[PDB]
Amino acid sequence: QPPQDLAAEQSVLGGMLLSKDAIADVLERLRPGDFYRPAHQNVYDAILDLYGRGEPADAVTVAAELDRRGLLRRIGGAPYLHTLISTVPTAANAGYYASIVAEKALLRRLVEAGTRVVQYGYAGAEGADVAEVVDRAQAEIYDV
Amino acid sequence: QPPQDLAAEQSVLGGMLLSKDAIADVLERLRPGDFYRPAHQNVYDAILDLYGRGEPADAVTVAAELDRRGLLRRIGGAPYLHTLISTVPTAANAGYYASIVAEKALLRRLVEAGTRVVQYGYAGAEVAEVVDRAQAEIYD
Amino acid sequence: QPPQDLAAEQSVLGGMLLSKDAIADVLERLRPGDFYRPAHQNVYDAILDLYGRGEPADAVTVAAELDRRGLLRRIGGAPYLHTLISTVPTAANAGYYASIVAEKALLRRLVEAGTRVVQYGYAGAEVVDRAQAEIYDV
Amino acid sequence: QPPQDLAAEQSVLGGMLLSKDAIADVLERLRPGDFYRPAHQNVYDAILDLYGRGEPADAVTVAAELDRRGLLRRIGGAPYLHTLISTVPTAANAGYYASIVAEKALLRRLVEAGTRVVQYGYAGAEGADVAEVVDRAQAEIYDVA
Amino acid sequence: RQPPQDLAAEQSVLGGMLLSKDAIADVLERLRPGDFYRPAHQNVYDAILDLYGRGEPADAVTVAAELDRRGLLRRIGGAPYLHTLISTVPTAANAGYYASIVAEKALLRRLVEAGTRVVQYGYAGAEVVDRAQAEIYDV
Amino acid sequence: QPPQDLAAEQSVLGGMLLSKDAIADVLERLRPGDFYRPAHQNVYDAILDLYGRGEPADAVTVAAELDRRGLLRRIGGAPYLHTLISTVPTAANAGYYASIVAEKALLRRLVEAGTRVVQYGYAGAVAEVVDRAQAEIYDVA
């Protein structure tokens, strides 16, 4: 089970749906890819799409952005967004929760890179010489 | 499967046991740690200890050096040393065989390093020291 | 199945009930016909009636206006009006919610248009024309 | 079942196989894709292939054009072409029957375009704005109109 | 697999030739007796050409007589089959078009026969390669 | 069974594994694809690979090269290379065996070209079809 904090992911998304100011704080710390759960990445991307267009991102506008993308039934609909809101009182701590999500994502990519390096050792790189295999494995750990 | 090449290892050793020139060509690209078979690392270490003394390293003298270390029986005795000499295609080519051993060793080091990094990632999950150590491991 | 966003409809209505400025924003984007739910169409008409006569349109006064048209029970009464007011995230965003309702209404008119061109096909230039009209009319 | 007239399709093809004047008449009215039955479209396309080349289109030359296309066995061989010819006395009425086939094709394309529009309505804005959804819908009917 | 051929086109060519002297001129430009798949058809074709070459009319009656005197009338299905040929041709003036179908099918059949010989030259074991080339380049 | 000579393929490869000089004799007579068995084509390609960068090509290096390529388990491992060597006393006849392999590869390409021609004749649809069949035999010739 890869490094993750699903509770922190829920709090981040809930905070973002409650406050525009929390979105700016989260953008500071997170990338799309940092969310372990694909549904959470979908929600995050929908929030950012609306925010980047200067449109409000709340339970209603976000559900509609998801639906336009055909993604609403995959997250579990508008009732999931309401569940996300309820994991946090207010959006005050959103940056803090985003820092947990980012730290767990670093660790998870470290684990993924490490397993990829192992895969390089056992299998090489499509017939490449060991020198190339070693350069590729070193870049894997660099890209964390 | 652990990256290794049995015949290349046997052939490096056989070439060395037959030719002092072969030892010079192998020393440049190998450490005893490069051998996957513990018997081979033992035999290699015995050859180099004698070579560092001016003592000719052939099957007989190597057997005596390994016996002295209490390692002769462990490595398969005189009969295994004989297998090594019969195996090498060409003693003059020991350098090429060595490069094969060296490459397999590198690949094995990746498996060990990668495995360590995975462990650090799980340890961190229980971060800056973790990431840095993981990078020490791979760049080494 | 029919394209619709019931939460967006509720939030348009809730915003208008909580804010006079919201009504002005929604007016530029919607027709009563855009609402899927008949109950929402009636609530909307009631707000616009109050508004057009310069009268305050809140939960209480709108209920009074619906009662007079004989529709308060039909739309779900004061409990339902309370639901609308609870549902809207932010009343000042009522225009954004209206855009959503309008977009769904357009998609729904597309389904409706396509369905009737199909019906025209199985019936019978007499039909080609009427069907042509239906989909540029969307 | 989609708007169609199989009897009128047979009569059109029979007429065309009997007379070059009938092919010309039919061409005034029909477009590629107008035949409901795939075997009938294949026969029609083979006749038009020959006619566009200034070659005659009779049972022999058409069976060979179909055979070159690997479609002769698909439709039941030259005996099928002889059956089509037997559906008509002369090729006098070929344009009349083509007008039936064309009307049914118009109506079928309307049914097909309609259901395509419905599909777009339900699967809306997948990639757009909704304007490009509406435009795809209108492009469907332009094709028909 | 069926060797490439079109038996209806073969019948129509011969039918048209029996019905029109101009058709024989048209067909002569496009065919040889060997283009016909059925031996019976080659025999009829040869008879027509022999008559034609002598300035003699070639019709159901005169062709049967030519064939009979060759000892081939019975072999080709008699005077009744000559009637089958004449009733088959959709339009005699289109003989040239039916001949192109027969010519094209004979070309395809020669490819099949040539490819088959080449395969056999492979299994028979510089001489073979030359023979195999000659087979394909003379199709 | 397609024109082939498995024994001569083994003997060619064994000769090449025994003598650098025989690699030159063989490549004088063989082209890519001449081996009937894919494993043999792999072995051959590995030998020329090592040859081209002036490395010795013996049972140890060739095996390592094939392993790099993911092809060693496919030939049966390093012991097969030892079986190939054991198939000939010395590499003296390597050119002779390569000439047999070349010949059979010619006759096999002739068989394949021929069956493709048969397929062109059945496929139909004319002047371009004839030219295709001829390009087929041009390749062999």
Curated annotation (Swiss-Prot), chain F:
Transmembrane segments: none annotated. Signal peptide: none annotated. It comes from the Bacteria. This is Replicative DNA helicase DnaB, 1st part. It comes from Mycobacterium tuberculosis (strain CDC 1551 / Oshkosh). The lineage of its organism: Bacteria, Bacillati, Actinomycetota, Actinomycetes, Mycobacteriales. The gene is dnaB. The chain holds residues 23 to 167 of 874 of the full protein.
